[PDB]
């Protein structure tokens, strides 16, 4: 545990820690959460402007909450799908049957986020194992290879929306130093 992006925080702004520990290391920013969220608003606005069906189109979609800065400091998938998108990574749904059918070994993947509405699990591959962390979790839940296979299944059964990140994720020093652990 030498150079590891281990930030601590509490009281909303959970997304600030989720992204801060998404690609193994830090690179994002709190203010960026409102920027990437407004990206969808930017496109939706011009879209709803032309394809305006009602008056609410250029009203509710002109000022979409959370997209134009959140009140409490929480953002949904609106910032997750965009965060990876701007870096060149794709988000795959491993909980939805229409996509889950791909059946791709999760141990081969890079990182995935689980959503249960009331909580989200930030899971990412570290060294040769899988680590789950959060703002409400100081202890990285060491996920074994054989346990991960079951974990993913348990999440699906529970109703955890699994967002798998496909592509080449920029690993940090924590990946190299974790290779010497079991």
């Amino acid at each position: 545990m030498e150079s590891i992006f281990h930030e601590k925080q509490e009281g909303s702004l959970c997304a600030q820690h989720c992204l801060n520990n998404l690609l193994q290391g830090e690179y994002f920013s709190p203010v960026e959460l409102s920027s990437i969220a407004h990206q969808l608003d930017e496109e939706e606005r011009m879209r709803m402007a032309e394809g305006g069906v009602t008056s609410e189109d250029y009203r509710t979609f002109l000022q979409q909450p959370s997209g134009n800065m959140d009140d409490s400091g929480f953002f949904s998938i609106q910032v997750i799908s965009n965060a990876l998108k701007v870096w060149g990574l794709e988000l795959i749904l491993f909980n939805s049957p229409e996509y889950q059918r791909l059946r791709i070994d999760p141990i081969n993947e890079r990182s995935f986020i689980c959503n249960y509405k009331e909580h989200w699990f930030t899971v990412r591959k570290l060294g040769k194992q899988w680590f789950n962390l959060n703002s409400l979790l100081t202890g990285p839940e060491l996920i074994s290879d054989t346990y991960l296979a079951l974990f993913l299944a348990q999440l699906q059964q529970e109703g955890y929306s699994i967002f798998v990140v496909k592509g080449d994720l920029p690993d940090c020093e924590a990946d190299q130093l974790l290779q010497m652990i079991r």
């Binding site: 609410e56 909450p65 929480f74 998938i77 509405k117 909580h119 989200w120 959060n134």
Partner: protein, 76 residues
Amino acid sequence: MQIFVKTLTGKTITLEVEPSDTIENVKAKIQDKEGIPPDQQRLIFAGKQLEDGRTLSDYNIQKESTLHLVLRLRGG
């Protein structure tokens, strides 16, 4: 009429309400389905926050309106 309440998680709650229904009552309806505390329920419509002491008609809210619920749902 029925409205669409977008919860911070990627869910749209379709609940039946009333024009003269108070925002606070709307929260109770959401609490009955999602279980989210009305007090922490930051109901925002088109950027404008819905005050508990106001009604749906106050913000010109009609049927199939896109509401947005804000709060620390992630927890950690």
